[PDB]
Design a protein around this nucleic acid. Structure first.
Ligand SMILES: Nc1ncnc2c1ncn2[C@@H]1O[C@H](CSCC[C@H](N)C(=O)O)[C@@H](O)[C@H]1O
Length: 352
DNA sequence: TAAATTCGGATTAGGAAT
DNA sequence: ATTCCTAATCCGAATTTA
């Protein structure tokens, strides 16, 4: 049974002890191509053991992105990248609630001792929840401090729904541009492209924390001085593309596979307004992307140097109330589609 | 009818006391 | 090996807005 590390610092995080500069990886796991798989860390029993077995028995690297941003994000990363001499993209985002939310100290109670947000999810706190918190604190506004039982109803619900103090006894959840900034994306990365505000919440909560991924992908910069061909599976709003962009790693070609059209619109928008000189190729459903097209694309452009993606975690997240059935759920089973495409790439890159 | 709103517990792990 | 607590958690779906 894989037991998650405590602290969840992986092979080491900036400004913290325990950095490991060398690991031994199984020979069946060696590149080329380099690959990078991501999923949530807190899965049902036995999920990561199944994932590792299908990804060459590489032990996952579990990192909580609270060591990179203000909001926790416990994820497991399986990859065959070198782990020595990583680096972070500058400047790093704000570390604490005080610095991330400057206007917060006007409304923040001193019995709310949070210095760190919980994980950014796809379903946001209710407006009726903000009211039930405002009504609970109302009968104690001329008292210096409300009682204890009134305090932890508010504190437990603020932690449960990731609420920040925005007004007088007003605890409201994060807005999309605040999620964008914490997740390492530039401002208004997901505003246009036909994305409704509701769709912005779901696309953001499902995405990478760019600084964490960029820290891991930073070892690629000395290896490829002329750029890389990238195979992006389950691209989303392009977390890996943004990370590679901030690392100043040229993207000669990006074959993206992402089924949501507004996500594909967000990526093409990002591709043009960053003036990417490379070519972007967008596919929709991974279940219709045949092995022969992969080989066909690899023969035109010369194989992929990196295969990066994160399969759906719908059936693995603890927030799922009706369909948290594990790796064989209808959406998270697309993890084996990731292994399918990756095996095609390895066939040409390394042989047998 | 796209968009917005609301509410709906269980599964893990760990600590600490039997 | 049990019991008992705190604690975090890339969510679905039914319904109403507009
Ligand atoms: N059948 C399918 N084919 C291709 N993509 C799919 C798919 N089913 C779900 N997806 C996509 O897989 C993505 C996983 S979310 C991961 C996206 C990435 N971590 C980011 O930075 O945004 C989702 O955006 C979802 O739309």
């Amino acid at each position: 049974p894989i037991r998650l590390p405590n602290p969840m610092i992986g092979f080491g995080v900036p400004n913290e002890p325990g950095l490991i500069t060398h690991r031994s990886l199984p020979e069946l796991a060696r590149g080329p191509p380099f690959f990078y798989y991501e999923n949530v860390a807190l899965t049902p029993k036995g999920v990561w053991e199944t994932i590792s077995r299908h990804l060459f028995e590489i032990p996952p690297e579990f990192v909580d992105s609270k060591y990179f941003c203000v909001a926790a994000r416990k994820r497991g990363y399986i990859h065959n990248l070198p782990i020595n001499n990583r680096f972070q993209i500058q400047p790093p985002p704000k570390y604490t609630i005080h610095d991330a939310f400057p206007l917060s100290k006007r409304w923040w109670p001193e019995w709310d001792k949070r210095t760190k947000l919980n994980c950014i999810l796809t379903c946001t706190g209710s407006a009726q929840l903000t009211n039930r918190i405002r009504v609970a604190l109302e009968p104690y506004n001329e008292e210096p401090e409300p009682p204890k039982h009134v305090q932890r109803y508010v504190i437990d619900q603020c932690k449960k729904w990731n609420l920040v103090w925005v007004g007088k006894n007003k605890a409201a959840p994060l807005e999309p541009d605040e999620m964008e900034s914490i997740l390492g994306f530039p401002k208004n990365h997901t505003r246009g492209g036909g994305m409704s505000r509701t769709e912005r919440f779901k696309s953001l909560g499902n995405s990478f924390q760019v600084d964490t991924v960029a820290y891991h992908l930073s070892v690629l910069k000395p290896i490829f001085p002329h750029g890389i061909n990238v195979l992006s599976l389950f691209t989303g709003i392009g977390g890996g593309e943004v990370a590679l962009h901030r690392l100043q790693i040229k993207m000669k070609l990006v074959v993206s596979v992402e089924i949501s059209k507004v996500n594909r619109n967000i990526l093409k928008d990002f591709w043009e307004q960053t003036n990417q000189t490379g070519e972007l190729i967008e596919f929709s459903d991974i279940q219709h992307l045949t092995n022969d097209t992969i080989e066909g694309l690899m023969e035109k452009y010369g194989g992929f140097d990196l295969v990066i993606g994160g399969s759906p975690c719908n059936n693995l997240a603890g927030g799922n109330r009706v369909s948290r059935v594990g790796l064989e759920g209808d959406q998270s089973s697309l993890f084996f589609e990731y292994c399918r495409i990756l095996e095609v790439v390895r066939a040409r890159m390394r042989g047998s």
